[PDB]
Structure 1
Amino acid sequence: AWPKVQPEVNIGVVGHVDHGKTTLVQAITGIWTSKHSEELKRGMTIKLGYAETNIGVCESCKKPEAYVTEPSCKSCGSDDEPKFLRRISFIDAPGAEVLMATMLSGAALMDGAILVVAANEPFPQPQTREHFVALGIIGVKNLIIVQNKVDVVSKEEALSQYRQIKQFTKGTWAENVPIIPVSALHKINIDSLIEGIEEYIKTPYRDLSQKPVMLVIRSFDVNKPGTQFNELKGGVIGGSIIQGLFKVDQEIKVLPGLRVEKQGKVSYEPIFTKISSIRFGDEEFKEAKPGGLVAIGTYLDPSLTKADNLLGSIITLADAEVPVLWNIRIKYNLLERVVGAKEMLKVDPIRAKETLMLSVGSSTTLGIVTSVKKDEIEVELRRPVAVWSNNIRTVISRQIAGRWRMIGWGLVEI
């Protein structure tokens, strides 16, 4: 048998709308990540999607067919059990141009990524460009480019696009990134992709002695109809542990916390609770480390967590010291052009009194620029952000032609 363990790595899946991201995750894991009503009706990812799979290798078989996602080697002609390598997980991002902020919030959780490029669409499409730029900005450099839908183009066309992709990455940080052709729909060459994941998206070093921090991307009420009047649970909070570790029965707090009234003013009150349970997928654990998206059970009133109420929060230990800031100072840089538009325009300099969008960890916040300098802006936010470390990455977006567009990036200066 294979061990039951948490995923140890988060692999983002990004790219232009309808290029096959969600179908690719299904090809690898068997899971369709779209669970919301609107997602199923529109046939598109809207919230961040998630799926897990074990990875192993049949030591008697040849690569890439030796790579498997289940404990059998029958497919490569061996009766031996495959050696367990690791459990991995996927963050399935929306490629819709209006959902870039959600993509950015997911990118904060990624240890590496797959950029999916449809072989039967002109290259590079706007969000192919935009997601590529975002990965580079955020520092997700462990990248595999997947050439999807090769089932519906000729060898000639696929090779032509292959050359254009290599020329696109030429002279960039991604110059040496592998390109792997697949059909997600017909599950062709998926084994080569799994091999590629093992080779190019290794499990990164973790620091388990840093103060525990989890970035929140989901929260919900797990209570269902037809259940006994006392089997019901406190709120559950879902996210990615980015450093340290959490254990059942630990005293934790949610930051910035709950929006409340205090002395005639809007205020945020840290939410204190205790970990009641830890779950990855369908399995319970006594502790949780970086890698995967974890579900943290709490003793909170489920009305506090329902409907992704706590998205953008962080969780730390109860006694941890973490800045929660209404005003932030950012050492910034601007992109030269707006890459996400069909027509790429120049980026105008930041001006005082502009309303900008700030992506910090899993959080997304609007604020007003109160100050602009050469290297530095100060922003008054519509709600505070938890800044758990010095020099955290922020991505800056501006509303251009009715759409929020990434225009720069920086470090939050504390």
Structure 2
Amino acid sequence: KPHLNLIVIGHVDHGKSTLVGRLLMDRGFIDEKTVKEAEEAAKKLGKESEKFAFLLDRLKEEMRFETKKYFFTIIDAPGHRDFVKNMITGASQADAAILVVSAKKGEYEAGMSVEGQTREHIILAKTMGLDQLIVAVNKMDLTEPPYDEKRYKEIVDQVSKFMRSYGFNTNKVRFVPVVAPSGDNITHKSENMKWYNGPTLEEYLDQLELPPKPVDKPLRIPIQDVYSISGVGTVPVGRVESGVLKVGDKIVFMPAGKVGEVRSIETHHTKMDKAEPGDNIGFNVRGVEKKDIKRGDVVGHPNNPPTVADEFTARIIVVWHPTALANGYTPVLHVHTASVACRVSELVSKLDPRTGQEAEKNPQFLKQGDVAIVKFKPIKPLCVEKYNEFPPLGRFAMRDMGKTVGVGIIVDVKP
């Protein structure tokens, strides 16, 4: 049963913590000590809802639940310390998201207003690649009249049109009318919204698709070493990061752009017919001059040559810097097997560390602790990919004086 990280987003007071708490109480693993104390509190008050009210506070003072197909771990939503940093470093990545939208009069409008967080979080979900966003139109009991289908449809339509106007796919976005406190249409069907003939929020979580497997992505093999075995020939060594390499395949070495053919493959001194992601292999290639192959280079199949960056844009965290970083700064970037000096060509903007939204356009310089969108221009041809396409070739460390000055995620590459 796959483990997925869930992020619950939406405007303040729309019902995020309540939904989260509802999911944990109904499908999580809260300790018996706390559970019994909650059930005890309910007794004393003589109100069933008190168990939930009690748990919510215990949760607040304090996050995993299980559905039919997955184990979900609710991670940090925006508005938190290190939110952007942890995503840049890979310390915490969101696999799925639930956008909570309040149907209550005025609340939905506030959330979708220019300054609202429904609009902000949808845009964030977009940059985060959360194409399978589940939208929980919450507080359905507070519409006028309660459980109003028209209010729900109006909201779905509006959020959907908005999503599309921002490139957000929509085909995999799912909406569900819900009531967080009671778990209506979340962990059980609602008997109050007979007009809704669709899946429960939990059922939608179980409908979530896992991301593409590296084996299904185009072949990428960062070169670690290259030898010329007497009698054998040119034999580069590297780990297959994506795709599949097979004896007889035609392959291209970038940045050189030289095509060759794979004559043999070996993992652990044992010959193989094909190599898959994760296999550290040595492969004999015919037709490519060893001169055109160096550590840091990347192999792919001719139809999908590894991207060579003329310029690339990255979201970075400045982990360490004694003074200030500015345009022209040229640290050595370590990405996959490569180590190349890259000149900071532009400081596009500083980001809010808690949210990920722009804080300042074109900062004059960056200081330790800053999160920003920066452009780099490699000093010599460098193979890199967008982190969201080929993760292993998309995260890098900026090194200087034996220290990691920063970590970055590649968001765009200019070939």
Sort the TM-score into its range (normalised by shorter chain). Answer: 0.3 to 0.5
The TM-score with structure 1 as length reference comes to 0.41
> Which of the two has greater strand per residue?
1
Larger Rg: 2
